[PDB]
Amino acid sequence: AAAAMTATRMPSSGSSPSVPSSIIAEEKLLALLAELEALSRQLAALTQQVSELREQQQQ
Amino acid sequence: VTTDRSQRLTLRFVPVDREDTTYSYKARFTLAVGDNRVLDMASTYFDIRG
């Protein structure tokens, strides 16, 4: 009634960026698709000359 | 009906800017429609590799 009455008396907000580091970029990209063919070409050339041992030993 | 000048059929644009992030990738292109041409946007698509 008196004394104190003179003054006065959720779910999901879904953030995303959190506490990780900063990020950067560059545009000098992508030789790498050539080596996948270099590697599998030269791999064949190994077997090709293993065959050239065998095809001369068989003579 | 068809031009007697040198001119491309297909143009490829690399991003002028990009922003790879936690859950999204963003890219900007300068879509330059050169002179004496028209582009139908139905002939445009993003060639993504990853």
Automatic annotation (TrEMBL), chain A:
Localization annotation: Virion; Host nucleus
Keyword Coiled coil: yes
Induction summary: Expressed in the intermediate phase of the viral replicative cycle.
Primary location recorded for the protein, binned into one broad class: virion
An annotated Gene Ontology molecular function: hexon binding
Keyword Coiled coil attached: yes
Alphabetically ordered keywords of this record: Capsid decoration protein, Capsid protein, Coiled coil, Host nucleus, Host-virus interaction, Virion, Virus entry into host cell
Signal peptide: none
GO BP: any one term: symbiont entry into host cell
Coiled coil (residue ranges): 29-56
GO cellular component: host cell nucleus; viral capsid, decoration
Superkingdom classification of source: Viruses
Subunit details: Homotrimer. Interacts with hexon protein; this interaction tethers the hexons together. Self-interacts with adjacent proteins. Interacts with kinesin light chain KLC1; this interaction leads to capsid disruption at the nuclear pore complex during virus entry into host cell.
Function per UniProt: Structural component of the virion that acts as a cement protein on the capsid exterior and forms triskelion structures consisting of three molecules that stabilize three hexon trimers at the center of each icosahedral facet and fixes the peripentonal hexons. Dispensable for assembly. During virus entry, recruits the anterograde motor kinesin-1 to the capsid docked at the nuclear pore complex thereby subjecting the docked capsid to a pulling force.
Domain notes: Three N-terminal domains of hexon-interlacing protein form triskelions between hexon capsomers.
Family stated for the protein in its record: Belongs to the adenoviridae hexon-interlacing protein family.
Miscellaneous field: This protein is only encoded by mastadenoviruses, and may therefore play a role in mammals tropism.
Protein name listed in UniProt: Hexon-interlacing protein
Organism the protein comes from: Human adenovirus D10
Species lineage: Viruses, Varidnaviria, Bamfordvirae, Preplasmiviricota, Polisuviricotina
Full protein stretch here: 68 to 131 of 134
UniProtKB/TrEMBL annotation, chain B:
Assembly: Homotrimer. Interacts with the capsid vertex protein; this interaction binds the peripentonal hexons to the neighboring penton base. Interacts with the hexon-linking protein; this interaction tethers the hexons surrounding the penton to those situated in the central plate of the facet. Interacts with the hexon-interlacing protein; this interaction lashes the hexons together. Interacts with host dyneins DYNC1LI1 and DYNC1I2; this interaction might be involved in intracellular microtubule-dependent transport of incoming viral capsid.
Note: All late proteins expressed from the major late promoter are produced by alternative splicing and alternative polyadenylation of the same gene giving rise to non-overlapping ORFs. A leader sequence is present in the N-terminus of all these mRNAs and is recognized by the viral shutoff protein to provide expression although conventional translation via ribosome scanning from the cap has been shut off in the host cell.
Induction pattern: Expressed in the late phase of the viral replicative cycle.
Superkingdom of origin organism: Viruses
Protein name: Hexon protein
Compartments (UniProt record): Host nucleus; Virion
UniProt function note: Major capsid protein that self-associates to form 240 hexon trimers, each in the shape of a hexagon, building most of the pseudo T=25 capsid. Assembled into trimeric units with the help of the chaperone shutoff protein. Transported by pre-protein VI to the nucleus where it associates with other structural proteins to form an empty capsid. Might be involved, through its interaction with host dyneins, in the intracellular microtubule-dependent transport of incoming viral capsid to the nucleus.
Entry similarity comment: Belongs to the adenoviridae hexon protein family.
